[PDB]
Design a protein around this nucleic acid. Sequence first.
RNA 1: AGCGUGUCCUACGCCGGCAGGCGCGGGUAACCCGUUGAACCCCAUUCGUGAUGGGGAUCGGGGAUUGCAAUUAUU
RNA 2: AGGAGUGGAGCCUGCGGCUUAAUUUGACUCAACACGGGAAACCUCACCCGGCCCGGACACGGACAGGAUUGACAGAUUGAU
Lengths: 95, 54, 100, 72, 120, 69, 79
Amino acid sequence: MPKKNRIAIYELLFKEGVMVAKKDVHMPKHPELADKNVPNLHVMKAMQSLKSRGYVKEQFAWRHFYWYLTNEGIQYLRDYLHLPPEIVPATLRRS
Amino acid sequence: HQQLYWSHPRKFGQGSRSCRVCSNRHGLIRKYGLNMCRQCFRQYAKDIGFIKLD
Amino acid sequence: HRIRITLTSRNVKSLEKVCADLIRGAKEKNLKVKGPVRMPTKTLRITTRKTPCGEGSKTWDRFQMRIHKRLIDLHSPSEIVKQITSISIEPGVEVEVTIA
Amino acid sequence: KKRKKKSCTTPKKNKHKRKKVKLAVLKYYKVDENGKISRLRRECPSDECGAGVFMASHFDRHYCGKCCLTYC
Amino acid sequence: FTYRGVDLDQLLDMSYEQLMQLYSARQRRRLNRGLRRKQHSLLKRLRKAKKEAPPMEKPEVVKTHLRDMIILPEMVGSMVGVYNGKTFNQVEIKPEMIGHYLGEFSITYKPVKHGRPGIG
Amino acid sequence: YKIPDWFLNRQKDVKDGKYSQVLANGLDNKLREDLERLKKIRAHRGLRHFWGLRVRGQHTKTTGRRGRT
Amino acid sequence: VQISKKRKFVADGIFKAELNEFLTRELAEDGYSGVEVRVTPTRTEIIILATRTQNVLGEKGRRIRELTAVVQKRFGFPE
RNA sequence: AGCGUGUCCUACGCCGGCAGGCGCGGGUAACCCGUUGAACCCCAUUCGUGAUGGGGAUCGGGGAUUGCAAUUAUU
RNA sequence: AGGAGUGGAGCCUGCGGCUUAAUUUGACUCAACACGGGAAACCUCACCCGGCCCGGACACGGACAGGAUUGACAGAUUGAU
Ligand SMILES: [Zn+2]
Ligand SMILES: [Zn+2]
């Protein structure tokens, strides 16, 4: 998994608090990650890794994975991407 | 290997269609574009809007 | 100038209530209307084997869905058109408007 | 059916182990005591990796690993 | 030998896009659709083994999985091992075979000799 | 006499490629050659004709049990 | 270029069947009891009936703001 | 005739014996195929009790389509 | 009381058997046998003969940026670019 692909996947999940994928390992491009050439397999196997550490919670239904960031995920991706502490996911900014 | 990993054609036949719920390849209902298998349609028929009248 | 309103539903009671409300409102204002014409009912049929394994006495489920259609014609400006439709809202009814 | 365990094949295939070459950067540049350098490897005229990527000095061809371009 | 009144001497000189008037409909249609990379790679291998052989001696076997291959006149004289599913069987191209497929000449099943009837 | 070519019983012959209608004594003299071609050139269908089994890819499990003892 | 009405009335029930299944596996331990879809031309509303209303939106409403963003990605709604 | 399907269902014109091919058109359908010119039925002809022109199995040559691939014959 | 029949023939399709490298498998009176939407060229596919890939998360230990690893032209080899 190229480091550019890994960074692209991680900093897209950060803007929201959610991620969606289809259980299709032969799909050549993830629709949310077009023009970056990130396959659908890489997203699946990256969210598999982030779940095992406890930073995200998943839900599966009808060929679809729905992942959510946990409080330990914002704390962990803020140091991985060296983001300013003045960055918060779109889920955390309303109401 | 990249040339030949998923390189058999999958344009037609049962090996190119599957259930939209359970991904099974046997007993699929293509009519109206249901795309649900024989046994998953009996489970969600009322939710879709099908009624047993006669 | 001609305004065609197409209604389509699966519950004929609700659909007829909506159509009657629209016709009555158009009569209430100063409009000329062409009455509700009923297109033939659409009957969709799925027949399935009841069993999941092909063992028993070969019984079949007969499933079906029914779609009801209407058409209404008006001769009025769109400003006048877009009040009565917004008043009456009902679930399951697919209201469509076409200007000539 | 019933499992029948036939594992016999022409022995066993061996996966290619790469060779650990130490300081491969040395052989690309020849440095004397006067400071001037000589480039011992012929270089590929391309855009993806030009200006820094050397080709393969084989016995009959020159070959760029990244470009897969071969001059005979 | 001759095919439709045309012998091998000119058959080897007949243009590939011109053989389609001597074959039957099926093989004319296949030649019209086109030969692919696996077919060309097998033709090239059969050519090499034919040229790199003693003149008065048969060539070396070129084994292939391609049972659906038209037997062209350029194949005449080749020594070909056709895969039947388990083992490669040796098949030599005789002239009168210039029409059929390859897999026809390597049977994929054992002829049945029946034994003692059992339960039924 | 202006009879179209698609009307005969051997149209594009294998050995000479001529459109001819074969008749009573010749019609059976050009079938044995057809089978001998595929028996000498060991085609699958020529071996089927040789063993006496069926030719056009049929189901021999149930039908065809005449001649066989 | 639009779709036939035979296929449109069907596709509106396949969409509502999967949404109920997704919400069933998500909010069951919070009293999930049904969903209702109101297709307003400007804004598609989805009403979720449940017992524990506090465990559906959650503190600061940080949970129903996650659902409304994970649903539109799945079903291709505009933002 | 009636029940049904259709973004693959197809009208119209030209070359073909045909299976079938080329150019324009319509239809997301009580709008187009389609006023769905269906088959038995019905009216004239030939045949004339016979393994017969009944009945079509089996097999040999050609031709055309679907498909990446039809040889253990796809149709 | 009767009508059309099936059981006889040719063939199409399922079950045993017998073969086979494999001829994948469930179901055996009514309550198995044109049933598993089961009309399988490839896929389907489980079965047979071979050959690539890991798509083995995560935790710990080792080695390693004086490089952990990654992919690749040509000759050979291979059914195969
Ligand atoms: Zn299913
Ligand atoms: Zn280069």
